[PDB]
Scaffold this active site. Sequence first.
Site, short mmCIF file in Angstrom:
data_model
loop_
_atom_site.label_atom_id
_atom_site.label_comp_id
_atom_site.label_asym_id
_atom_site.label_seq_id
_atom_site.Cartn_x
_atom_site.Cartn_y
_atom_site.Cartn_z
N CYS A 151 10.87 23.02 -14.00
CA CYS A 151 12.24 22.50 -14.38
C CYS A 151 13.22 23.93 -14.50
O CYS A 151 14.34 23.85 -14.57
CB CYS A 151 11.83 22.33 -16.01
SG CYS A 151 10.87 23.69 -16.87
N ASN B 49 17.91 15.51 -17.43
CA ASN B 49 16.54 15.72 -17.15
C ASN B 49 16.33 15.82 -15.88
O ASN B 49 17.01 15.16 -15.01
CB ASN B 49 15.78 14.72 -18.07
CG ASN B 49 14.21 15.47 -18.47
OD1 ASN B 49 13.70 16.52 -17.66
ND2 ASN B 49 13.39 15.00 -19.04
N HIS C 144 10.66 23.47 -21.74
CA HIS C 144 11.35 22.74 -20.78
C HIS C 144 12.75 23.14 -20.55
O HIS C 144 13.49 22.96 -21.38
CB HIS C 144 10.97 21.05 -21.14
CG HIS C 144 11.43 20.43 -19.96
ND1 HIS C 144 11.18 20.27 -18.66
CD2 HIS C 144 12.26 19.22 -20.07
CE1 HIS C 144 11.67 19.68 -18.08
NE2 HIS C 144 12.30 18.76 -18.60
C1 LIG Z 1 9.00 23.52 -17.48
C2 LIG Z 1 8.49 22.17 -16.87
O1 LIG Z 1 8.53 22.00 -15.80
N1 LIG Z 1 7.80 21.40 -17.96
C3 LIG Z 1 6.76 20.47 -17.61
C4 LIG Z 1 7.34 19.29 -16.94
O2 LIG Z 1 8.57 19.05 -16.70
N2 LIG Z 1 6.39 18.50 -15.96
C5 LIG Z 1 5.34 19.23 -15.24
C6 LIG Z 1 4.81 17.89 -14.33
C7 LIG Z 1 6.04 16.77 -14.23
C8 LIG Z 1 6.56 17.13 -15.54
C9 LIG Z 1 6.50 15.93 -16.58
O3 LIG Z 1 6.89 14.82 -16.15
O4 LIG Z 1 6.25 16.69 -17.84
C10 LIG Z 1 6.15 15.50 -18.94
C11 LIG Z 1 6.29 19.96 -19.09
C12 LIG Z 1 5.21 20.82 -19.54
C13 LIG Z 1 7.37 19.88 -20.13
C14 LIG Z 1 7.44 18.60 -20.95
O5 LIG Z 1 7.03 24.55 -17.26
C15 LIG Z 1 8.39 24.84 -16.88
C16 LIG Z 1 9.24 26.02 -17.66
O6 LIG Z 1 9.23 26.76 -16.50
N3 LIG Z 1 8.13 26.82 -18.52
C17 LIG Z 1 9.14 27.82 -19.26
C18 LIG Z 1 10.11 27.35 -20.09
C19 LIG Z 1 11.40 27.65 -19.90
#
Ligand SMILES: *[C@]1(C(=O)N[C@H](C(=O)N2CCC[C@H]2C(=O)OC)[C@@H](C)CC)O[C@@H]1C(=O)NCCC
EC number: 3.4.22.1
Length: 251
Positions: free
Chosen positions: A29, A217, A197
């Site tokens: 993300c 998102n 996130h």
């Molecule tokens: C930000 C991140 O990507 N978060 C996770 C995420 O978006 N997914 C990982 C697998 C597919 C996604 C999903 O559907 O999660 C439900 C999750 C943990 C957030 C809800 O870790 C990334 C970031 O870089 N971390 C530091 C914060 C800025």
Amino acid sequence: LPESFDAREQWPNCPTIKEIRDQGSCGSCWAFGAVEAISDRICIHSNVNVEVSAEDMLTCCGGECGDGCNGGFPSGAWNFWTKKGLVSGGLYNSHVGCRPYSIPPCEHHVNGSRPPCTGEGDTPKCSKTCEPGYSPSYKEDKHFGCSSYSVANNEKEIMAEIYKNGPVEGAFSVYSDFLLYKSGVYQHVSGEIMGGHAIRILGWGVENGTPYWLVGNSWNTDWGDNGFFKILRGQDHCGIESEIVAGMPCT
Ligand SMILES: *[C@]1(C(=O)N[C@H](C(=O)N2CCC[C@H]2C(=O)OC)[C@@H](C)CC)O[C@@H]1C(=O)NCCC
């Protein structure tokens, strides 16, 4: 500043602003919020349209941005844009640009035709080459930023930044109740913490007397409100106003 603002409507000639991507089964993300906003700003401040490669950011930044699919630092991503630049690259299997995303789209906490997402995803290799058939070369396809900065945890300053320079990248704490978001203005009331996130904030408004941030998102279009969501604005809710970053493209 206006009561409401939607970057999608304010900059009609920049379609990336309306786009929603899919980070796939990878904690990228941090990279997506960045390349998405950067794509928007390149268009806003160059009136050229470029689908900035999430792949290039995710795989080649390295430690300066964190740990690839294991999470990263938003400000570090914008730094990479100014230091090494970013090549073009579209969606998975799109064959658009120098380096299209290599991780397949999936279903993020929703039922659908794609495979369900699996938190388990490894960071792809940093390959400084473009897909076959694409021109120019990797080096020649780099787009550079000429500034990388952090916007203060101040509602008005954040609104002013978006109003003048375009969408920005932000981050907030995700609790489980956010996963099932469908509509309205999100406010955290229950659920275990999932982690930080990073996302793209492209505007603001007021819904039923509740001020909110318009956010894109990176979990595809069948999650939430066509891929977007609204979150409470003005109270640094879940830290949504505490980690805002942006930058300006060169020339
Ligand atoms: C930000 C991140 O990507 N978060 C996770 C995420 O978006 N997914 C990982 C697998 C597919 C996604 C999903 O559907 O999660 C439900 C999750 C943990 C957030 C809800 O870790 C990334 C970031 O870089 N971390 C530091 C914060 C800025």
